[PDB]
Amino acid sequence: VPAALKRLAKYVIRGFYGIEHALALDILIRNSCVKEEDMLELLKFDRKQLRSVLNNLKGDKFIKCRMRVETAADGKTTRHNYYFINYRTLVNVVKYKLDHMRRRIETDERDSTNRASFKCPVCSSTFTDLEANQLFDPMTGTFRCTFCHTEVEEDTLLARFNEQIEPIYALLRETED
């Protein structure tokens, strides 16, 4: 497994999931395939606590599960769940989530600038802050509707995102082969 894939997964798990998730994933990075029981004993988590962490990582498609069903020494049927990181699905979910996050931010920025800050009490025309200043009437000293001339009434995250997410973009690019 390429070092850059490992690092991508380690970065993303730390940034967007809890400590518990990071520590569970560390085991799956150390070893290709691991029994849930072995993970349980290593981490000292409660049983439901671990299962919930694994359920979350499986839902976000970071890890997959393969059951092994065998006859045990005492003759009973045994069901082991072996977990592993699925790097092709992990990289895709990461791209999917980052693309939608960006787009949600972009949409919020568009909405905020197109926000109807001013509204005519008569004809109900609305105006954005940019539109509003060219509504000012120096002869009355007030903002007046462009249509009926009635006095109008009242009523960056992307840059941060781009700063904070660049390490992941870089690791994504590094893995593109």
Partner 1 sequence: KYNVRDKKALLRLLDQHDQRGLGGILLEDIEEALPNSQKAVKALGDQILFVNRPDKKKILFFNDKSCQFSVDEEFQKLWRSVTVDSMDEEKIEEYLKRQGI
What is the contact surface with partner 1 in residues (CB under 8 A)? 7, 10-12, 14-16, 19-20, 23, 27, 30-31, 41-46, 48-49, 59-61, 89, 92-93, 95-97, 99-101, 104-105, 157, 160-161, 164-165, 167-168
Query: Does 145 engage in binding with Zn ion (CB under 5 A)?
Result: yes
Using a 10 angstrom Cβ sphere, with 0-12 exposed, 13-18 middle and 19 or more buried, the burial of residue 39 is buried
Among 24, 94, 120, 171, binds Zn ion (CB under 5 A): 120
CB of 100 to partner 1, least distance (A): 4
Using a 10 angstrom Cβ sphere, with 0-12 exposed, 13-18 middle and 19 or more buried, the burial of residue 175 is middle
How far is residue 135's CA from residue 132's CA, in Å, rounded to a whole number? 5
How far is residue 167's CA from residue 159's CA, in Å, rounded to a whole number? 14
How far is residue 115's CA from residue 159's CA, in Å, rounded to a whole number? 20
Q: Which does 43 bind (CB under 5 to 8 A by kind): Zn ion, partner 1, none?
A: partner 1
Nearer to partner 1, 7 or 144 (CB): 7
Nearer to partner 1, 7 or 149 (CB): 7
How far is residue 65's CA from residue 34's CA, in Å, rounded to a whole number? 9
Among 33, 116, 148, 157, binds Zn ion (CB under 5 A): 148
- What is the contact surface with Zn ion in residues (CB under 5 A)? 120, 122-123, 125, 145, 147-148, 150
